[PDB]
Nucleic acid binder design. Structure first.
Ligand SMILES: [Mg+2]
Ligand code: NA
Ligand code: NA
Length: 327
DNA sequence: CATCTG
DNA sequence: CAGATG
């Protein structure tokens, strides 16, 4: 946790770089388990050879750890922290919609910058376009003080369109957090489920409304169950308008709301532990359901959940207010 | 995993 | 349809 920090970090840099610049998935994937194992490792890795000793730890990584341990640095690491090529790929990628893949093309075309992008607004696709347009706003965290207003907003519109809607804002916002990075609303309706054959309108009608009233500004992607967009709190009495914020809306069949809701609320850490315990308690958990774990090895059959309560109960656990779902 | 591009 | 993104 700090005993092998630098090690795990450099390894991180290293891995990262393989996947993103080079297309080195194998290698990349290599650095990964390695930093993972050295991570769990209990003592102070005083040397390469010592580390080698670990699974996932071969000759090259060892060699690396050595140089690093021997000197406060790594050449290759330093060669990579320079190379404008490597750097550009790390940056272009900050643009929502631009992945590595793309980040590569652009560079090999000479687009290595924000300006490069603007000038070449043509090569960019819609999502990337927006992405570009809101670069700044996209990076700005979301203070709960807005979050509350936002939520206040979605909730009132979802309601008006249908009394039967059930909206929920998950995420860290849901978990207490003072600021979040994007709004994520869970959504269901009684009239939509596991079996029930579809109802796209279920998702579209609302989406509409939100943009009706102008909360939704752009559309990144809008499928029949997942909508990815841009929103923004109405700038009051002109002087101070709000940043544009990322937001996603997802339709969920009423029969798996809470698991989805539970799940989305996180944290990851709250998850696993929740997951792991459920396993003990003779169960199974994932995004949509909870299943009584048979003995023959495994087994399914969606136990019935009417609230986050119904879940905990199942695994016979202490109901956790969203706040305390931290770890 | 769902959506989009081309 | 593969392949990319979030
Ligand atoms: Mg968040
Ligand atoms: Na990106
Ligand atoms: Na292939």
């Amino acid at each position: 946790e700090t005993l092998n920090g630098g090690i795990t970090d450099m390894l991180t840099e290293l891995a990262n770089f393989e996947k993103n610049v080079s297309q080195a998935i194998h290698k990349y994937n290599a650095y990964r388990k390695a930093a993972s194992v050295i991570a769990k490792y209990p003592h102070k890795i005083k040397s390469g050879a010592e580390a080698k000793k670990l699974p996932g730890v071969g000759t090259k990584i060892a060699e690396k750890i050595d140089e690093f341990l021997a000197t406060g640095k790594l050449r290759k690491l330093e060669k990579i922290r320079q190379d404008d090529t490597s750097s550009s790929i790390n940056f272009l990628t900050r643009v929502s919609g631009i992945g590595p893949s793309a980040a590569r093309k652009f560079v090999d075309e000479g687009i290595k910058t924000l300006e490069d992008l603007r000038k070449n607004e043509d090569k960019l696709n819609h999502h990337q376009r927006i992405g570009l347009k809101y670069f700044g706003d996209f990076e700005k965290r979301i203070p709960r003080e807005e979050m509350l207003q936002m939520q206040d907003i979605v909730l009132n519109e979802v309601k008006k369109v249908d009394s039967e809607y059930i909206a929920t804002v998950c995420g860290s916002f849901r978990r207490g957090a003072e600021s979040s990075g994007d709004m994520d609303v869970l959504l269901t309706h009684p009239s939509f489920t596991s079996e029930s054959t579809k109802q796209p309108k279920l998702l579209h009608q609302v989406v509409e409304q939100l943009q009706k009233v102008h909360f939704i500004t752009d559309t990144l992607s809008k499928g029949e169950t997942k909508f990815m967009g841009v929103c923004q709190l109405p700038s009051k009495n002109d002087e101070k308008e709000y940043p544009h914020r990322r937001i996603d809306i997802r339709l969920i069949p009423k029969d798996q709301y809470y698991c989805g809701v539970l799940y989305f609320t996180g944290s990851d850490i709250f998850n696993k532990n929740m997951r792991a315990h459920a396993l003990e308690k003779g169960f199974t958990i994932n995004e949509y359901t909870i299943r009584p774990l048979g003995v023959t090895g495994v087994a399914g059959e969606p136990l019935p959940v009417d609230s986050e309560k119904d879940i905990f109960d199942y695994i016979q656990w202490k109901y956790r207010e969203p706040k305390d779902r931290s770890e």
